[PDB]
Amino acid sequence: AAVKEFFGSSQLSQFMDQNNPLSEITHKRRISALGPGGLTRERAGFEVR
Amino acid sequence: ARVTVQDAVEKIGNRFDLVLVAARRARQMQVGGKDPLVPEENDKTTVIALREIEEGLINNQILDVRERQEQQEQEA
Amino acid sequence: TEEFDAIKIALASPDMIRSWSFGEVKKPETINYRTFKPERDGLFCARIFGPVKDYECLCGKYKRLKHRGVICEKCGVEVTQTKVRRERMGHIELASPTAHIWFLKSLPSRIGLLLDMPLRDIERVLYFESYVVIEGGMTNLERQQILTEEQYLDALEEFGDEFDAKMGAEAIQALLKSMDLEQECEQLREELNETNSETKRKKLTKRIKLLEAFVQSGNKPEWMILTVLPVLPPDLRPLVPLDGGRFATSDLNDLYRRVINRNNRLKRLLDLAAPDIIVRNEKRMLQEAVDALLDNGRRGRAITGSNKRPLKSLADMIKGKQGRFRQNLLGKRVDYSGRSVITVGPYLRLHQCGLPKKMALELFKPFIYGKLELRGLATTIKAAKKMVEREEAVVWDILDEVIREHPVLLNRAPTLHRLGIQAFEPVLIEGKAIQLHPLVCAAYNADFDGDQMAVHVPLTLEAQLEARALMMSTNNILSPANGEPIIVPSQDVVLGLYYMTRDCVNAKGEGMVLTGPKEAERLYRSGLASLHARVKVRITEYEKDANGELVAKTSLKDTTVGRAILWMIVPKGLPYSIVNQALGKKAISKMLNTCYRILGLKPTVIFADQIMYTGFAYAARSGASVGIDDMVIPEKKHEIISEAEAEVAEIQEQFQSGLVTAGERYNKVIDIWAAANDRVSKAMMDNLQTETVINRDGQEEKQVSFNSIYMMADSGARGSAAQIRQLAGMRGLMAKPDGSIIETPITANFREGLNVLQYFISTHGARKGLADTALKTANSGYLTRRLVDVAQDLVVTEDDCGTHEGIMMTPVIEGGDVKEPLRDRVLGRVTAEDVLKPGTADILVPRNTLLHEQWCDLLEENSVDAVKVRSVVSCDTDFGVCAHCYGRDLARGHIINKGEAIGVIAAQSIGEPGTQLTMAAAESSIQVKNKGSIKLSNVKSVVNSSGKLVITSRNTELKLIDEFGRTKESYKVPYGAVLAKGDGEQVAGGETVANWDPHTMPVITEVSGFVRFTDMIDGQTITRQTDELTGLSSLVVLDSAERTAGGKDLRPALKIVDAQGNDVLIPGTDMPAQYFLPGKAIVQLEDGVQISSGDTLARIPQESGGTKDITGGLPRVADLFEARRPKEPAILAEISGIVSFGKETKGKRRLVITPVDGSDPYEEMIPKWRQLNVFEGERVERGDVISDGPEAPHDILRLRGVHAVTRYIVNEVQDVYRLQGVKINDKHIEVIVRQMLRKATIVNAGSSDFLEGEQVEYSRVKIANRELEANGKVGATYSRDLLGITKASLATESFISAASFQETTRVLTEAAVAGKRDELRGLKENVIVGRLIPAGTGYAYHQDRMRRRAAG
Amino acid sequence: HARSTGSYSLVTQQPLGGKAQFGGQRFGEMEVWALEAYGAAYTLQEMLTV
Amino acid sequence: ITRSIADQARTIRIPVHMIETINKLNRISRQMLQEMGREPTPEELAERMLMPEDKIRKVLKIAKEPISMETPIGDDEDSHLGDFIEDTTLELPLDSATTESLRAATHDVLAGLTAREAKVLRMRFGIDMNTDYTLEEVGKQFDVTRERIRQIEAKALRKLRHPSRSEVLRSFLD
DNA sequence: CCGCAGATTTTTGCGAAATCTTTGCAGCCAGAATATAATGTGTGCATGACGGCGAATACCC
DNA sequence: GGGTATTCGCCGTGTACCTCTCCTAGCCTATTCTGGCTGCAAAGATTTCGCAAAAATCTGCGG
RNA sequence: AGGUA
Known part of the structure; x- marks a missing residue:
């Protein structure tokens, strides 16, 4: 149940933006500073941006 | 179609009670009971009210006096 | 259908809470899971809150409309309309009284301050950390004191059945019962007349004010402790079925379930006589649950099972951002609206916009039904619906008919100013995107790159008319923040116009002679000439002259073919010189402005549309293209x-x-x-x-x-x-x-x-750049929200008030040159004084009147330096402002109309450009750039034996009088300078008229004699660095930030005495002959040196500037509007008279000003880190600075007056804005200021408490009343106080407005405990209520209601 | 998306909802300010109540 | 503790015996899941219990607790679930206008009939008053308690059968 | 333009069934009753904006 | 006296779309007897619906 | 959640 919660409903588990091969490549290569253990959007916080 | 209301503002300088008086005129125009005084081009009551005020037929005073006289023939 | 003049907020009583309740919620049950019929008597109950489905008892007994006036007595369930379930409230009978969290953890704790008892003590008592004595007896125990477990046990053992002490909310409620308000008020009133001690009197005054306010509120303090807890109607906490095992349930439902569970458990424990630990634990349960329900978040959060998220509470549903959610934002959704992507509309007229056929059909479905049934093509609404969904050609003519006259509102996704919503006549277009007029996109700040706009349909006839008169684009050709037009040709049309008017040096058809521009167009279109070529053309220009009559003048002009072609478009009445030139954006904007000012509205709109068409056409014919070669690299x-x-x-x-x-x-x-x-x-x-x-x-x-x-x-x-x-x-x-x-x-x-x-x-x-844009957009939104809040209730209520007050109005010169002339700042303003000509004493401006372009031209011809102008701040009108004191600016050159809401337009005008805000020869020698008369203001200088015009003090200005009366170059002379020019000497441009060292400020002596060291210890105030070459030294007077243990007891100074020893005073200067050396004044001349008039005494080191100390943009504007301190307030001379020093360094040095006459003692504090510019024994005046550095608005208002602080704020904010090229009429900042100072502090009361922060309008009407009456009580005197925009909006007269857009919980608590009664008469108040706003069109209505109130 | 009648809400009556026909356009506080800036009173009342 | 979990932990009420049945179902589901190693198949669940299987699935539906609307739809979108829930207890304005037009048409048609026939019809079905009356109740007021009142009603119906008063009402019912 | 036929109106009659209350039944359900070995412990602490600001005790001079 | 000198909470944070449905967990957990409640089955009591059918009534036109 | 202004 917890593994399914991670893979399905999480800040870093997203529907693949699938309208281009480039879109898929970018989504799989994406790097997020957000998520569990990262940075909340309460930032700027200009340093990281 | 009435592109500008500046000529109407000239007759009624407040530009806000102008809306009230022309709205009263147009409502008496749409709701049955009153007949037009200016020719139309298959237009609704709004530009009719604008044209009537623009030529000086209708302002606050004319609407008020007319509602009196009509009140007197209906009471008879 | 509901009429009510005002809304009262007060403390809910348990009896009236039961009055609201229709039944007691006794069970935490909700429904029967499989059967979704609500339980009895649970949170959802037909027996209490009413039936679920329309007009039938939930027992299967009565199902009809007949059984509606009688409820079902055969079972618990009653039968009414289902909407009743949305309004019926319930009540829960709490076994133990429970404290209200809002009255507890607000920063001012109403329970705490009413009991005058610190917060930690209430927290410990309520949460069962310690006991508190609910009245004692003949004990050594006070009526109120907290006791711990062992202390309470010891008191109980020592003192028997005389000791009444409990623990928790029951104890707090008992304390509130034992406290009587009126009797204590009488006691305080008696004591005040008898007591003379300052602190005792202050305590008595504070307590009597608080208790009298509470009594006037008509509330009983015991009501702060909740005995019965109301429960919201179930429909407002809905439970709606959803597919699968998931069902939508309210966090309120779970919170009330927890509260009911804990209450029932407490009841059971009390019935079972449970041990004290357990019952205390369960009371803790109930208190925590009630606190979470009322406001979850101030108690260490509450989470539910199967869901990890802070539960929504009633406070959380009320408190919102931005503003109240359901009422205004987010978001007050609206019907009869559409949305789509926008495209260019280059064929449209200005008063119309392209609307797609499908959106028009969907938007106007009721209108289509009405007209179809009117002409009888459908016998019922259902048939009309079938016809419109079939989309037959019949309904399309009906649609064209209904669209023909109906105007529709177009709205940009962000709305920064009132031009963000504009009416247009919709034109049916096949397609799917809204076509927008190209001229209007500038106002919307909308670029066709996927921007989406919304369309609204004004339904009622009044709204249609209202949109056509006010919402219309053609009625809004001028920006509300500045008279210059907002519908200006922008990019493609400007390029076309420029190419059409720009002249070459050689082209086909040069030297031809033409009559009329028609031959020019014929030659161009036939290819017999070029679009631009020097040609003599005979053209008839019309001039508005005499009394408004056209003057046809026909003559030959040397111009170009494109210019003549354009002149064909230009309406009759404008000079040809306007187009006989290269036309940029500025040229076209100025030409439109001139056309509007000279001709009127309709010619302006027609000319704008025609110029758009011409510019587009000739841009397309231009073939202007950007290649790879048209960026030629410089060689x-x-x-x-x-x-x-x-x-x-x-x-x-x-x-x-x-x-x-x-x-x-x-x-x-x-x-x-x-x-x-x-x-x-x-x-x-x-x-x-x-x-x-x-x-x-x-x-x-x-x-x-x-x-x-x-x-x-x-x-x-x-x-x-x-x-x-x-x-x-x-x-x-x-x-x-x-x-x-x-x-x-x-x-x-x-x-x-x-x-x-x-x-x-x-x-x-x-x-x-991108991050800056995002953050500045958010900050601008917040700023404009605050401006709207503070300027919300301001509206023009009178045509004229009558007042000769105003502001002294001049062209502004910052630095060395003028950047904003008199005319622009005074255009559209009303005169406050009939200013004479700069020469003869002739009145060219009559009694107070609107200043249009002709009057501004007259003022320019007879250049008067200053004009007194009636500002909104000096307007004597109350509950609004008079029409004259505002001005004229709107969308017309005429005076403002009564009822117009100037506050909102001003707030938008100041807020919208916020997204545009992303932010030697100086102080060495003054060099006047032009030649003019030299004048000195506030100068203290006397010519010495060396001919040196040495200026003392940092408050002297050097102006430059022009040929008539106008200053055009202004400079600031610091303390100590040398000037070779007099007070009337003519100076050439670029000539060094003043000079002083850029490394230091020299103190040039204006007298002679030996230097005597007064208040000197060689080693405490000064340090030995003697470098005697000719009798000099490097003795350092320690800086005015820190000194030694003996340098803090004296004020080092240099007296100038003669050989006889008598004082030789400096003539023609307020400075005494004893120079009080400030920090770092290096004493070059030692004791016993003959000084000449023109010799430096002590240098004050500097750095010739070179460091930036100026900020702007959104933070600067916000700080100005919040009246923030500059972290170093430049204290002013707060009373005229002679100044003197006091006792040195008790930590902060004291300065005593004693006026030459009147009340002498005015000792005050000055911190020892400041750099003093004050010298003891000089005649200063109220307003003169005492220490260097930036100023704060508070003391500026307090001392220099209201007009001075208005001028300061206007100048400072306009300095920020002109830095970015954005021009705002200063009247907007003026009305914002007028809203900032709406509160005043009473000194002498009429019916006030001598320190009461009171609305100035009430104070002004009261002082007017007492002055007209023979009763001059008391009194009454007031001093206007300045509050930041957030504070001013926060402390308004209406609690609805304050609670809406600011701290909702605290404002609501303050209003409830005070029992406030807001009487509306405010834009946002009536917006929340849902009636016509008392502004503009609605002002006539409310004025009528005003007549219906207080009189038959 | 365009509507004249359709999805309302439970707790409030603000029209919104539906992936077939959506709600109306949010007439937020910015637009209310825009109307208040003019003498727009009846149009504002339509935006708010009717 | 079991009583507390059964009562105060479920948002909707679930009986204690039903809660025990749910717990038994979950335990047997876990047993079958770890034995077969794939999933709990409803057939084996039916086999283990005396419970048919439709009751099993309805119980499984019941065992799940309601969710808040304050949860974001779409994994932390700034919109909440309750912001999308349509009010199904509100009559559509289309239907309200249809009802008003139908009431007007029925009133006009009743006005098109005779006095006593229309009068009988008004109280027989409760037309344009907030009360409804039975056939015998109308007959008592018409001082005729016999087959005559129902014959008058049938005569009114037969008169309405004509394609001159039914055409206007024909549109409402398709 | 008037009297009877087609169409319309008048009048008496029987079957049908549904509904309201009462009685028997089955699934739902609540409390009352019985005596397995288990008490200082768990526990969630989830954590990187930015500016303003008064209230609440501390501490030097 | 007294003036900072810390720490201790509270508050504010752009607009408006769209796609997504993703929202949901342990299972460690004892037996039962008595009585009522509620949905349903069954019966007496009663009103309300249609044809029946003949008799009275309404309406068209030519000799 | 992602994307748009």
């Missing part, structure tokens, strides 16, 4: 780059030699690269500007280039000189992280592709 780019590389290499080599410091080397390199960038840009602009060298008849000539990019650069269509500089030249210096300018700039441009590393460098600038 000297490589040479300049190589040179600059050579000098920076030389500088780096010299840095290794240690000859130049790292900072100086960096500065030199930066300057070298800046010079190289400027040279490259200048060479590029020279190349592009006059690129055409073609011969006129064989003789080559240099004239304006046909280069396209130079056309878009020059016409101002898109891209400035800086923009083209990055394209054709070199993009130059930028910055790296930490915001420092990079040592090596980018030597490449976008035509010579940037290499990897330079692009990576530019990426930092790009990221910074």
Whole structure:
């Protein structure tokens, strides 16, 4: 149940933006500073941006 | 179609009670009971009210006096 | 259908809570799971809150409309309408009284302050940490005191059945019961008349004010402790079925379930006589649950099972951002609206916009039904629905009919100013996107790159008319923040106009003679001539002259063919000179402004549409294209780059030699690269500007280039000189992280592709720009929200009030030159004084009257230096402002109309440009740039034996009187200077009229004699650095930030005495002969040195500036409007008279001002880190500064007066705005200020408490009443106080407005405990209520209601 | 998306909802300010109540 | 503790015996899941219990607790679930206008009939008053309590059968 | 333009069934009753904006 | 006296779309007897619906 | 959640 919660409903588990091969490549290569253990959007916080 | 209301503002300088008086005129125009005084081009009551005020037929005073006289023939 | 003049908020009583309740919620049950019929008697209950489905008992007994006046008595369930379930409230009978969290953890704790008892003590008592005595007896135990477990046990053992003490909310409620308000009020009133001690009187006054306010509220303090808890109607906490095992349930439902569970458990435990620990635990349960329900978040959060998220509470549903959710935002959704992407509408007229057929059909479905049934094509609404969903051709004519006259509102996704919503006549178009008029996109700030706009349909006839009169685009051709038109040709049309008017040096058909521009158009269209060529054309220009009559003058003008073609478009009545020129954006904007001012509205709209069409057509015929060759690289780019590389290499080599410091080397390199960038840009602009060298008849000539990019650069269509500089030249210096300018700039441009590393460098600038745009947009939104809040209730209520007060109005000169003239700042204002001509005493401006362009021209002809203008701040009107004191600005040159809401338009005007805000020869020698009369203001100078006009004090100004009366150059003379010019001497331009050392301020003696050291200890105040060469020394007076243990007990000074020893005073100066040396005043002249008038006494070191100390943009504007301190307030001389020093350094040095007459003692504090500009024994006046540094608005208002603080705020904010090129009429800032100072502090009361922060309008009507009456009580005197916009909006008269857009919980608590009764008469109040606003169209209605109130 | 009648809400009556026909357009506080700036009273009342 | 979990932990009430049945179902589901190693198949669940299987699935539906609307739809979108829930207890304005037009048409048609026939019809079905009356109740007021009142009603119906008063009402019912 | 036929109106009659209350039944359900070995412990602490600001005790001079 | 000198909470944070449905967990957990409640089955009591059918009534036109 | 202004 917890593994399914991670893979399905999480800040870093997203529907693949699938309208281009480039879109898929970018989504799989994406790097997020957000998520569990990262940075909340309460930032700027200009340093990281 | 009435592109500008500046000529109407000239007759009624407040530009806000102008809306009230022309709205009263147009409502008496749409709701049955009153007949037009200016020719139309298959237009609704709004530009009719604008044209009537623009030529000086209708302002606050004319609407008020007319509602009196009509009140007197209906009471008879 | 509901009429009510006001809303009262007060403390809910348990009896009236039961009055609201229709039944007691006794069970936490909700429903029967499989059967979704609500349980009895649970949170959802038909027996309590009413039936679920329409007009039938939930037992299967009665199902009909007949059984509606009688409830079902055969079972618990009643039968009514189902909407009743949305309004019926319930109540829960709490076994133990429970404290209200809002009255507890608000920063002012109403329970705490009413009991005058600190917060920790209430927290410990309520949460069962300690006992508290609910009245004692004949004990040594006070009526109120907290006791711990062992202390309470010891008291109980020591004192028997006389000791009443409990624990928790029951104890708090018992305390509130035992406290009587009226009796304590009487006791305090008696004591005040008897007590004379200051502290005792202050305590009595505070307590009596608090208790009297509570009594006037008509509330009983026991009501703060909740005995019965109301429960919200179930429909407002809905439970709706959803597919699968998931069902939508309210967090309120779970919270009330928890509360009911804990209450029932407490009841059971009490019935079972449970041990004290358990019952205390369960009371803790109930208190925690009630606190979470009322406001979850101030108790260490509450989470539910199967869901990890803070539960929604009633406070959380009320408190929202931005503003109240359901009422205004987010978001007050609306019907009869659509949304779509926008496209250009280049064929449309200004008063109309393209609306797609499908959106028009869907929007107007009721109208289509009405007209179909009117002409009888459908016998029922259902048949009309079938017809419209079939979309037959029949309904389309009906649709055209209903659209023909109906105007629709177009709205941009963000709305920054009132132009964000504009009416247009919809025109049916096949397609799917809204076509928008190209001229209007500038107002919307909408670019066709996927922007979506919304369309609203004004339904009622009044709304249709209201949109046509006010919402219409043609009625809003002028910006509300400035008279110059907002519908200005922008980019493509400007380019077309420029190409049409710009002249060549040789083309087909030069030297021809033409009559009328019609021959010009014929020649151009036939290809017999060129669009631009010098031609003599006979044209009839019409001039508005005499009394408003057209004067036809027909003569020959030397112009171009394109210019004549344009003149064909120009309506009759304008001078031809306006078009006989190259036309940029500025030229076209000015031409439209002149057309509007001279002709009127309809000619302006027609001319704007025609110029749009002409510009588009001739831009298309232009074929203006940007290629790869139209960024011609300047030939000297490589040479300049190589040179600059050579000098920076030389500088780096010299840095290794240690000859130049790292900072100086960096500065030199930066300057070298800046010079190289400027040279490259200048060479590029020279190349592009006059690129055409073609011969006129064989003789080559240099004239304006046909280069396209130079056309878009020059016409101002898109891209400035800086923009083209990055394209054709070199993009130059930028910055790296930490915001420092990079040592090596980018030597490449976008035509010579940037290499990897330079692009990576530019990426930092790009990221910074984007993040700045985002953050500045958010900050601008917050700022404009605050401005709307403070300026919400302000509206023009009177045509005139009658007042000769105002502001002294002058063209502003900051630095050395004028940047904003008199005319622009006074245009559209009303006169407050009949100002005379600068020469003869002749009145050219009559009694207070509106100043239009003619009066401004008259004022320019007879240049008067200053004009008194009735500002809104000085208006005597209450509950609004008079029409004159505002001005004229709106969308017309006429005076403001009564009922117009100036507050909101001003707030929008100041807020909208917020997204545009992303932010030697000085102080050494004054150099007047022009030749004019020299005048000194507030000067203290006397000519000495050396002819030196030495100016003392830092409050002296040097103006420059022009030929008539106008100052055009103003400067500030610091303390100590040398001037070779007099008070009437003429000075040439660029001539050094004053001079002083840039390294130090010299104190030049104006008398003679020996220097005597007064208050000197060699080693405490001054330090020995004697370097006697001719009798000199480097004795250092320690800086006025820190001194020694003996330097803090004396004020070091230099007295000037003669040989006899008698005092020799300086003539013609307030300065005494005893120079009080400030910090770092290095005593060059030792004791016993003959000083000449013209010799330095003590130098004050400086740095000749070189450091930035000015900020602007959104934070600066916000701080100005919040009246923030500048972290170093420049204290002023707060009373006129002689000044003197006091006892030195009790930590902060005291300064005593004693006026020459009247109440003498005015000792005050001055901190010892300040740099004093005050000298003891001089005659100062109220307003003079005492210490250097920036000022704060508070003391400016308090001392210099209201007009002075208004002038300061206006000038400071306009300085920020003019820095970015945005112009705002100062009346907007004036009305914002007028809203900021709506509160005043009473000194002498009429019916107040001598310190009461009270609304000025009530104070003003009261003082008017007492003055007109024979009763001059008391009194009454007031002093206007300045509050920040957030504070002013927070402390308004209506609690609805304050609670809406600011701290909702605290405002609601304050209003409830005070029992406030807001009486509406405010835009946002009536918005929340849902009636006509008391502004504009609605002002007539409310004024009628005002007549219906207080009178039959 | 365009509507004249359709999805309302439970707790409030603000029209919104539906992936077939959506709600109306949010007439937020910005637009209310825009109307208040003019003498727009009846149109504002339509935006708010009717 | 079991009583507390059964009562105060479920948002909707679930009986204690039903809660025990749910717990048994979950335990047997876990047993079958770890034995078969794939999933709990409803057939084996039916086999283990005396419970048919439709009751099993309805119980499984019941065992799940309601969710808040304050949860974001779409994994932390700034919109909440309750912001999308349509009010199904509100009559559509289309239907309200249809009802008003139908009431007007029925009133006009009743006015098109005779006095006593229309009068009988008004109280027989409760037309244009907030009360409804039975056939015998109308007959008592018409001082005729016999087959005559129902014959008058049938005569009114037969008169309405004509395609001159039914055409206007024909549109409402398709 | 008037009297009977077609169409319309008048009048008496029987079957049908549904509904309201009462009685028997089955699934739902609540409390009352019985005596397995288990008490200082768990526990969630989830954590990187930014500016303003008064209230609440501390501490030097 | 007294003036900072810390720490201790509270508050504010752009607009408006769209796609997504993703929202949901342990299972460690004892037996039962008595009585009522509620949905449903069954029966007496009663009103309300249609044809039946003949008798009275309404309406068209030519001799 | 992602994307748009």
